Write an enzyme that holds these catalytic residues in place. Sequence first.
Site: not given
Length: 227
Positions: A42, A87, A179
Amino acid sequence: IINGSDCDMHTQPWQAALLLRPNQLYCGAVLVHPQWLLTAAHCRKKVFRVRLGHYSLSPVYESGQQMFQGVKSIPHPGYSHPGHSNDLMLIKLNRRIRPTKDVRPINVSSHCPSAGTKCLVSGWGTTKSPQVHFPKVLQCLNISVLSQKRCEDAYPRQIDDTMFCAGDKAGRDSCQGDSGGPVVCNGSLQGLVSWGDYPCARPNRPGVYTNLCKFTKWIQETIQANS
Ligand SMILES: *[C@@H]1O[C@H](CO)[C@@H](O[C@@H]2O[C@H](CO)[C@@H](O)[C@H](O)[C@H]2NC(C)=O)[C@H](O)[C@H]1NC(C)=O
């Protein structure tokens, strides 16, 4: 990183930062090969820079620092725009890194994390939530992996096998801006900062990280195919 402490200089030479013009620090990343980084799917961006061997957040020049560009982004095929599964993404650098004490790749563990395992998570993410507050330098935090069972209760029907929960202690957790960052356990890369509840650090609400042990083969094959 919430309630973490300043990392010790020169440790984590595999920690990478994904910058956007001018110097917008978005997502973290991890050097897992002389010319390959790993980050969350992402975090995909078309135009961006890669900064390695740099301690502080600001573009303040540092020795040992190295800059690169992303020449190719390969997100795992299973990553779905809505779901958080699979992810992870591979990023190839324009050139091989110059091996130094500040810039060194880390290996990806083939063994999955068992409950109780103590891990180290790091990033330049906000140190407060919901209130934004970026740190001055790389933040470090120890977190223990929870059982998949407990992980499933905290996040019913959304927790998956390609992910794992970590962080039991109160007030300690990863947050926005971290992230794609590394989660190291037993000296190897076990996961990546993926997602969690909001605001960050809520009690009984652990952070969720990509379970890298499930993608060792894909990572190796993809790297070899693009070498
Ligand atoms: C995270 O936890 C580890 C494990 O307890 C800490 O590592 C210790 O670091 C000290 C340095 O202050 C060493 O003297 C010890 O030998 C280390 N422990 C062992 C036996 O591995 C680490 O300091 C912690 N870091 C953070 C950010 O909390």
